[PDB]
Amino acid sequence: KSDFKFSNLLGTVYRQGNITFSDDGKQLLSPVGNRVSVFDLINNKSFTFEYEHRKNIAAIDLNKQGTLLISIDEDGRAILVNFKARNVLHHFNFKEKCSAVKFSPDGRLFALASGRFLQIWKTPDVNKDRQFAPFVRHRVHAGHFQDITSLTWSQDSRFILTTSKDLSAKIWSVDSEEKNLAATTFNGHRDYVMGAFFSHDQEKIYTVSKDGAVFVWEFTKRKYSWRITKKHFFYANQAKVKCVTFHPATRLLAVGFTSGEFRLYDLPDFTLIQQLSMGQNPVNTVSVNQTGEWLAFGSSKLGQLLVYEWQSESYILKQQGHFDSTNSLAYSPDGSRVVTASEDGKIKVWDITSGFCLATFEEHTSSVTAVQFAKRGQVMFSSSLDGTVRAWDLIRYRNFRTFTGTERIQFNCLAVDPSGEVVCAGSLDNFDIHVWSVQTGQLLDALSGHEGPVSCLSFSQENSVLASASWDKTIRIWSIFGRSQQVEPIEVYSDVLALSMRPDGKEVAVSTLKGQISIFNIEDAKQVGNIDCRKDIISGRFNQDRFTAKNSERSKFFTTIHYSFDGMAIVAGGNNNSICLYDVPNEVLLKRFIVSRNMALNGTLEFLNSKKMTEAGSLDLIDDAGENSDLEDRIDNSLPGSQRGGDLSTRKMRPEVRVTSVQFSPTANAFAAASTEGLLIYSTNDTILFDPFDLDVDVTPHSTVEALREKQFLNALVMAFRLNEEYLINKVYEAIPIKEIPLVASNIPAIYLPRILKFIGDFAIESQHIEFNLIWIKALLSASGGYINEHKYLFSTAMRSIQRFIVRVAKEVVNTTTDNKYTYRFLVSTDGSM
């Protein structure tokens, strides 16, 4: 009930750093601004690592055996990851800024380009235990004049070449005896050399620079050593190369220009194979597959990632996250689609299983501020600051109507009736709850009576009344259906915002500005319980702050509440660094979540460091843009009052951490919070926890398998729920025959019914047994369907997951069964030819 853990960072597919593939073409690893995200483009499943870095990720390299992952921070905080174990092995601190990480193709030892030095270390063995000092450095090579900016191993495991911020680029042999074989210094580039590569043979080295020059170095005469055979020029007039990569087996360069174009080249001839363009973003990261036919391309300032096969002129995924901008959230009724708002106006239907957006909706010019769903998820609504509330389809991907006000006032929140008839929205400016019909786009009336802005609205799913949270410190209940037209105020202590209501539809959860969360009853307007919230909130002291984090009154409240669909829990999230999960009738918190750990974000720390205040000014508040070597990032267009603006170059500060919209998942015991870092998803689906229920001395896992031997099927299954271990439940569930299913399911006790329906809905989503699982669903629902009707809210998370299972994976099998049968009937019984 309360063993939640981080499982997926939906959205923000790429932020900065070195995107890479696996040794196979399956896994794609992308550096998100905190942690490594592991997607899989063959088996469509995503995964985000639970460990947190301290700042933004600089470089990422995976071992060629797919076992060890090294992710290095921008300040050199190296973190080992046992990749299959998905846990942390060691926390190294490289003292300088590191720029490139690459293992050898052998995988025994890896090279690090940190500072002006190249550091070669021996990789620790994975099967050895977690030792204190697993890192042993082979050598350090210091023969350079400025910072090393690129690294490339050989196709063998003995030659390492590095290109630096100085004009030269040197080849260093990792063996001591072979120092005479490879010690020459390649130079002559007019600008920033940021990539050299061995050819398919060890003989040639192709060096790529910033100015557009590719130099081909060949070991020949005018003894004789390392002349230049031919130079090649990109002729990009103002576009500069940002990074390059080169698969030697397919002899393909893939260059990245800062204008937005990327080109593909065959190296002994220098022919442009394909040149495409993303947009106006600089191509910050280029990587190649091991097989040399998949190219992973990524830009930073729009946060997009593009994996493109070079052979067929067609992408595979063109995804684009958006940092800092996800204003709102809305789950789908099936727990597989989560849509989100953006400051760009984009409404993007993300997918849970693979962390990529399905469809985008850009028809709002202004920022979309609230997003909600209605009527089984086929229709969906969105409010923006543009002066409109827009319906959408998820079947034809188009708006039905664009409802508007009488003068196009702004909008704060949106709410919908559970039947698709009435939409409503609230405003900062006019503070009257406008209502529209879904059918007729004209507005019906303006439900008014408030002093100051209506903050949040929600319709009741049973009584069909709406509750308004307002800055009048009053909760207003509007009964707008069926000749009632009556207004009921429930006034609270302080400035109440972010209302939420139970799926039972008889309670109102609200979040006051004073910090406390109150819970009322809609029909009986007295207060039936409040929970204090001010103490368990981490209000991060900003770097521009001039007060302690104790009396920092900035984010010591909650501005997001949503109930659990069971009606038993409340997730409270706010402007703070904390996500809290309260229990409703027991008044106390369950556990508290830290959303992010990043001094790249503002409020991650209550205690700032004392070595950062000088005698004047904080050290990290010092505008250090001028020390950069380029022009476009040196350009400052920062407006003075760009608090939550339209870009990030206008900010002049670092972004602040906050969560702004949290909803529980309706299926799989999870909840998703739209954060500054993106869209966090905490889930309990790992189920590695010993949760018992009425255990005894005799009941053991040995007693489970023994009861399966003597075929006491109900005694095996019910006493398997006593341990409530998932493999123990899975052992008895897949072993009982079909004919003993309806006798077992008819006599399962009423206590274990929410456990079996949660198990069947969770297991059958990814399981090949459609026919077996749907036999169990038929037998359970036809022998105990009265109890599930009598207690709907106890089973509503599990019952939604079961009907998710039959619709999403089992219905289209029936659709293909019907489609194949009907086209067979036509083709074999009708006309011939000629």
Partner: protein, 85 residues
Amino acid sequence: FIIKFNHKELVSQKNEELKLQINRVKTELRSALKSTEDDLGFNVQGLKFVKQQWNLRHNYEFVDEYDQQEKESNSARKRVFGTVI
């Protein structure tokens, strides 16, 4: 809608005649619905074949892939709707 709303009385009243009457009417309504669903699904799949046969026989197709997909977008159906910017 009647049996959905009056479900608790219709199920918890014991009658062999009610067991026989719903057995006659569920098996016959499903057979009548399957009869009118078999004709609909045959006409969907049968006439989709008639469309795609003509789209390879009479339609002179084009090798140039990006020029073919531009020409199909110009030859597709277009409709005008009132919008608000």
